[PDB]
Amino acid sequence: YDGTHCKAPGNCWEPKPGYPDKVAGSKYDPKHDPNELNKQAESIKAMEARNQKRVENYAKTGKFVYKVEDI
């Protein structure tokens, strides 16, 4: 693995000698909990929905209000 042998344009990763192609089912399987993986993205969706609440409320009233329960 010297970085110069490319499967495709912008894809040059090769396993180091003795290491596997894929980690799933190997001794270095990260075994990620797909529920943990998805948490970031769901918390972003909820930040965006609250933000759009604050924007609409500024549009409707001319007054900015942060706390979404006081809207």
Binding site: Y1, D2, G3, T4, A8, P9, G10, N11, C12, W13, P15, K16, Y19, D21, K22, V23, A24, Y28, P30, K31, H32, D33, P34, E36, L37, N38, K39, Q40, A41, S43, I44, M47, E48, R50, N51, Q52, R54, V55, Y58, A59, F64, Y66
Partner: protein
């Protein structure tokens, strides 16, 4: 923002952290110069009211200095005709738990500004550690709007300064050490409404790519690579946060920045190029759509997080005047690209001891790896230069366009590194390596260097006891100013590197100096307040040499020179 650009050409002002849209950090002021800087004295000071690392620097606009602090990110305005009084203050109420998910001290790289217009009054912008972007009235400090960008429950913070372009303010990301997937966001300055959001990993729609993305250099890679260079869903926690600095070319209407490192540090857990972490981007201002993207460190093995500053310049490339970007990365290479096409012009070693890479092949764009300095599970890799701290970190550097030289604060830090397996839990650290760090082969921890970025020619190089972390300021007085971790501000002759002046500040510096004119007189200002990564050992009373992600052992002597502090120093003749 063309009004902001215009204020930036006025030497009375310092309107953005980078000084101007090209990040020149260069002043035309010459009252203070190489032959009288020896007489520079302290004119006045302020306290910030906090300890911890003070990054970034003050802004000055229309006769008002704006000051900011590490967490809880207090902001103060000071009228330069009455330097003892605070015109206004803004004191955020933030969850103290934000501190526990910051990797590298509770630093903040500072404020942005936009002048009055249709949106309407002049505003100060603040990123809080707790993930909020806040718009303040620049004259009164009144909160105009506030939005949530990042969620600390996910280990997602903000430390990078906001950045204003046109009617937008851009907000980065932080937390790759806790598995945060990087993203940058544009908000409307009137409203705080989200305009666009571009992720560093994942499907093409999230990446936000122009249909002509990488047209000029297809061999960098184009579409689908944000998924195909990862195995399965490992991109969803894959890092690439952007906590550094930006640049903008108004004429091309393009924004430049770097995405950080892939998570975890354990390379074996994330096979593949891990695009588009570790990438230099050029994105359309209005839509955020990338026109180009160059990955400097495919499949990072060393945490060379690619967030460093972008310095724009216009220089001859084979006899033709070419619009460029210059970019001293963590990986110890200094990159210069054509800022219109993205084409690689040069990529040379900031110091000859860089060893992870033998050289970058300029025609393929590919760094030729040396397997002797790779990292991998079930191996303790020894003597890798640079270390995870980089041969260059978050300091904004400077460019003298008369001399065609960049002046840079450089680090000289090498490491050993062994990964370990670990689970990802949202809200917990997701690092997966143990490091020891120490001086590079030349034996000191820092340097200051002057170089030509097209040719790679080193004009001068001088040593420093500690890494030079905070960046630099250059002037037409033939001087480069910088602060040191051990607590000096210093000035060097820009022709030779000769030391012309130094002053003993109370604490170490990790931000940059500014200069401005007020009422016909030149001033220099800087923060003093050590912290950030080099300072973790002293800030948190740490003694294990592998703690602070490896930094503690390398910087254990720092605490013999400096304590914590928080002040602003202003100098004049």
């Amino acid at each position: 923002n063309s009004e902001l650009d215009r204020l930036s050409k006025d030497d009375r002002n310092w309107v953005m952290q980078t000084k101007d849209y090209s990040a020149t950090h260069f002043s035309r002021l010459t009252e203070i110069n190489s032959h009288n800087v020896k007489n520079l004295k302290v004119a006045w000071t302020l306290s910030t009211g906090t300890l911890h690392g003070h990054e970034g620097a003050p802004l000055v606009v229309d006769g008002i200095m704006y000051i900011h602090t590490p967490f809880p990110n207090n902001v103060y305005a000071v009228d330069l005709n009455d330097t003892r009084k605070m015109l206004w203050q803004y004191k955020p109420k933030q969850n103290p738990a934000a501190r526990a998910v910051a990797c590298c001290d509770v630093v903040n790289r500072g404020l942005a500004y936009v002048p009055a217009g249709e949106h309407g009054p002049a505003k100060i912008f603040l990123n809080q550690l707790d993930g909020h972007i806040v718009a303040l009235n620049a004259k009164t400090g009144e909160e105009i709007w506030k939005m949530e960008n990042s969620d600390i429950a996910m280990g997602s913070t903000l430390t990078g300064a906001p950045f204003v372009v046109k009617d937008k303010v851009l907000v980065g990301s932080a937390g790759a050490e806790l598995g945060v997937r990087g993203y940058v966001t544009a908000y409307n300055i009137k409203d705080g409404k989200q305009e666009w959001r571009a992720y560093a990993t994942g499907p093409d729609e999230d990446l936000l790519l122009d249909k002509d993305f990488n047209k000029d250099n297809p061999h960098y890679g184009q579409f689908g690579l944000g998924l195909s260079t990862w195995e399965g869903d490992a991109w969803k926690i894959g890092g690439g946060t952007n906590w550094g600095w930006y640049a903008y070319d108004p004429k091309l209407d393009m924004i430049y920045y770097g995405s950080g490192n892939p998570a975890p540090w354990n390379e074996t857990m994330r096979p593949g190029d891990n695009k588009w972490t570790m990438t230099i981007w050029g994105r359309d201002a209005d839509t955020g759509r990338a026109k180009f993207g160059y990955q400097k460190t495919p499949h990072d093995e060393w945490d060379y997080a690619g967030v460093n500053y972008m310095g724009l310049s216009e220089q001859e490339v084979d006899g033709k005047l070419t619009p460029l970007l210059t970019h001293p990365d963590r990986n110890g290479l200094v990159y210069t690209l054509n800022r219109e096409t993205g084409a690689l012009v040069n990529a040379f070693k900031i110091d000859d001891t860089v060893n992870w890479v033998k050289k970058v092949d300029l025609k393929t764009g590919l760094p030729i790896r040396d397997p002797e300095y790779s990292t991998r599970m079930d191996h303790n890799a020894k003597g890798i230069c640079p270390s995870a701290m980089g041969y260059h970190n978050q300091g904004i550097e400077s460019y003298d366009p008369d001399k065609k030289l960049f002046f840079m604060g450089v680090n000289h830090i090498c490491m050993d590194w062994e990964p370990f397996m670990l689970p990802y839990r949202a809200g917990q650290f997701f690092v997966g390596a143990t490091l020891n760090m120490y001086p590079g082969p030349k034996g000191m921890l820092g340097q200051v260097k002057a170089m030509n970025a097209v040719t790679g020619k080193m004009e001068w190089e001088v040593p420093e006891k500690f890494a030079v972390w905070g960046g630099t300021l250059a002037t037409a007085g033939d001087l480069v100013f910088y602060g040191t971790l051990d607590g000096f501000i210093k000035a060097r002759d820009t022709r030779t590197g000769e030391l012309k002046w130094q002053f003993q500040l109370p604490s170490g510096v990790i931000g940059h100096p500014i200069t401005y004119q007020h009422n016909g007189k030149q001033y220099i200002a800087i923060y003093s307040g050590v912290g950030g990564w080099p300072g973790v050992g002293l800030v948190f009373d740490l003694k294990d040499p592998t703690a602070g992600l490896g930094a503690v052992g390398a910087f254990r002597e720092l605490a013999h020179y400096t304590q914590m502090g928080g002040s602003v120093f202003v100098f004049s003749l």
